[PDB]
């Protein structure tokens, strides 16, 4: 309202409203991260098996 002879505020506001869905979230990673986790789980379980058997020994 402070601007009196805008002639362009409507245009930019319409552009912003049309471009409100700028982009969706990128949830692409669903298996490679799972691969890293399964490798880490394997390493952790073999590690703790080794540790437990070593302390018992």
């Amino acid at each position: 309202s402070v601007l009196k002879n805008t002639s362009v505020i409507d245009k930019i506001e319409s552009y912003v409203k049309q471009y409100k869905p700028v982009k969706i979230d990128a949830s692409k990673q669903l298996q490679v991260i799972e691969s890293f986790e399964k490798h880490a789980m394997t390493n952790a379980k073999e590690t703790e098996s080794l540790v437990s058997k070593e302390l018992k020994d």
């Binding site: 402070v2 601007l3 009196k4 002879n5 805008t6 362009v8 505020i9």
Partner: protein
């Protein structure tokens, strides 16, 4: 756009000031030295009527 409009207001004020010289020259050549004298004299009379 906001400060462009502010500069536009400043520019229109400046152009009015520029036209002020033509406004002054309008009365400079106008034979105004008689009606103005009578008006200021009667204004002085009214001023001193209260006093």
């Amino acid at each position: 756009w906001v400060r462009y409009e502010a500069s536009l207001r400043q520019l229109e004020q400046r152009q009015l000031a520029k036209s002020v010289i033509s406004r002054v020259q309008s009365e400079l050549g106008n034979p105004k030295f008689q009606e103005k004298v009578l008006q200021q004299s009667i204004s002085e009379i009214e001023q001193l009527l209260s006093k």
